[PDB]
């Protein structure tokens, strides 16, 4: 748990924490959250929604969605609690909890999530149980506004699982069975509209049980945090138009966009046009200066890991580990 969060977690109602299923949805840098609308897919008892509530402040909004009666009944009955503790009155809540399938957010209950309404969509380990991954990615792209982002963690594999592994119940329930090969992930998400997938962090996932392991003998699984911006001008490739971006301060000593780009306070960093556009069209614009497009110079090479920046996801994931 990030230090900045511990105090806020100490304030969240014990019953929310005690009954929360799963690991926490990781959040972008806290400062970047101010005033954002954030949606948590598979929100459970609301741990992450309530943490976001505080961080987005009273101008922001937070939405939780889940299909477990159950955990939502608990989420819903602590809204006032948390408005008082964060904003001084039972009546100033900026959260709501919706009941529904995450693959169809338009029909969730009491109200749907409309088109182009969310700045950040977060989730941890919801995809590999999903019934249609494409439909989930398309629904995310729908609810995001331009410049918004899916900032999420899930389990992926370094190769395509066999049919026998995809059918196994214990593998399925551990979010391994339904894991995509990273490259299949990248095509699928692009088919949904996300043309540029940025690696934030990766951890190994191990199958130690030798019976399970025999179904997936040499497969390497990873827990990957990716960020996928919805920005109309992104291309499939990472092109140099001569630009530089400069982090102006305000949300930390330095801003780490992904594993290739870190921006120190007031130091110009050369960027590809995709990165320049993400910065310009997302909420991040508020803390950056981005220089104007020159003439095209070819593929972007002005990064000390440029070869990896252009390589398949597999290769990026495997080296950030090694």
Question: Is residue 58 exposed (0-12), middle (13-18) or buried (19+ Cβ within 10 Å)?
Answer: middle
Cα–Cα distance for residue pair 273/129, rounded to 1 Å = 35
Q: Which stretch binds Ca ion (CB under 5 A): 15-23, 56-64, 197-205, 216-224?
A: 15-23
Asked whether position 42 contacts Ca ion by CB under 5 A, the answer is yes
Cα–Cα distance for residue pair 91/68, rounded to 1 Å = 26
Any binding-site annotation on 220? yes
Any binding-site annotation on 249? no
Asked whether position 70 contacts Ca ion by CB under 5 A, the answer is no
Asked whether position 46 contacts Ca ion by CB under 5 A, the answer is no
Any binding-site annotation on 158? yes
Cα–Cα distance for residue pair 100/68, rounded to 1 Å = 9
Cα–Cα distance for residue pair 45/56, rounded to 1 Å = 19
Q: Which of residues 152-181 bind ligand PA0 (CB under 6 A)?
A: 174-175
Cα–Cα distance for residue pair 90/248, rounded to 1 Å = 37
Structure token digits, residue 62: 């937070």
Any binding-site annotation on 318? yes
By beta-carbon proximity to ligand PA0, the closer residue of 60 and 177 is 177
DSSP H or E stretch at residue 86: helix 79-87
By beta-carbon proximity to Ca ion, the closer residue of 32 and 153 is 153
Cα–Cα distance for residue pair 147/188, rounded to 1 Å = 20
The residue from 13, 29, 125, 248 that contacts ligand PA0 (CB under 6 A) is 125
Any binding-site annotation on 21? yes
Q: Tell which residue, 58, 26, 29, has the closest CA to residue 284.
A: 29
Interior angle at CA 119, CA 309 and CA 194, nearest 5: 40
Cα–Cα distance for residue pair 92/129, rounded to 1 Å = 35
To ligand PA0, the closest distance from the beta carbon of 69 in angstroms equals 19
To ligand PA0, the closest distance from the beta carbon of 203 in angstroms equals 11
Find which of ligand PA0, Ca ion, none residue 42 binds, CB within 5 to 8 Å per kind.
Ca ion
The residue from 19, 22, 158, 239 that contacts Ca ion (CB under 5 A) is 22
Q: Which residues bind ligand PA0 (CB under 6 A)?
A: 125, 174-175
User: Which residues are at the interface with Ca ion (CB under 5 A)?
Assistant: 22, 42, 44
Q: Residues within the annotated binding site for Ca(2+)? A: 42, 158, 220, 318
Binding residues for S-adenosyl-L-homocysteine: 21, 66, 102-103
């Amino acid at each position: 748990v990030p230090e900045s969060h511990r105090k806020i977690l100490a304030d969240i109602a014990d019953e929310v924490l005690e009954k929360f299923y799963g690991a926490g949805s990781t959040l972008p840098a806290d400062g970047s959250l101010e005033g954002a609308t954030v949606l948590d897919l598979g929100c459970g008892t609301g741990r992450d929604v309530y943490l976001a509530s505080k961080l987005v402040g009273e101008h922001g909004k937070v939405i939780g969605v889940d299909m477990l009666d159950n955990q939502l009944e608990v989420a819903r009955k602590y809204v006032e609690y948390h408005a008082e503790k964060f904003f001084g009155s039972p009546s100033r809540s900026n959260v709501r909890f919706l009941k529904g399938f995450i693959e169809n957010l338009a029909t969730a209950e009491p109200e749907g999530v409309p088109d182009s309404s969310v700045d950040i969509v977060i989730s941890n380990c919801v995809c590999n149980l999903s019934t249609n991954k494409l439909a989930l990615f398309k629904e995310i792209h729908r609810v995001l506004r331009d410049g918004g982002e899916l900032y999420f963690s899930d389990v992926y594999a370094d190769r395509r699982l066999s049919e026998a592994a995809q059918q196994d119940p214990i593998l399925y329930g551990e979010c391994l069975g339904g894991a995509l090969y990273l490259e299949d992930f990248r095509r699928l998400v692009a088919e949904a509209g996300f043309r540029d997938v940025r690696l934030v962090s990766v951890g190994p996932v191990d199958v130690s049980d030798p019976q399970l392991r025999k179904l997936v003998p040499d497969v390497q699984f990873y827990s990957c945090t990716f960020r996928c911006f919805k920005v109309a001008t992104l291309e499939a490739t990472r092109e140099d138009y001569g630009q530089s971006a400069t982090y102006l301060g305000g949300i930390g000593e330095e801003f780490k966009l992904d594993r290739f780009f870190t921006f120190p306070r007031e130091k110009p960093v050369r960027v590809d046009r995709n990165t320049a556009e993400i910065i310009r069209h997302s909420r991040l614009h508020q803390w950056f200066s981005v220089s104007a497009e020159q003439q095209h110079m070819g593929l972007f090479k002005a990064n000390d890991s440029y070869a990896l920046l252009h390589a398949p996801l597999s290769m990026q994931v495997e080296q950030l580990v090694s």
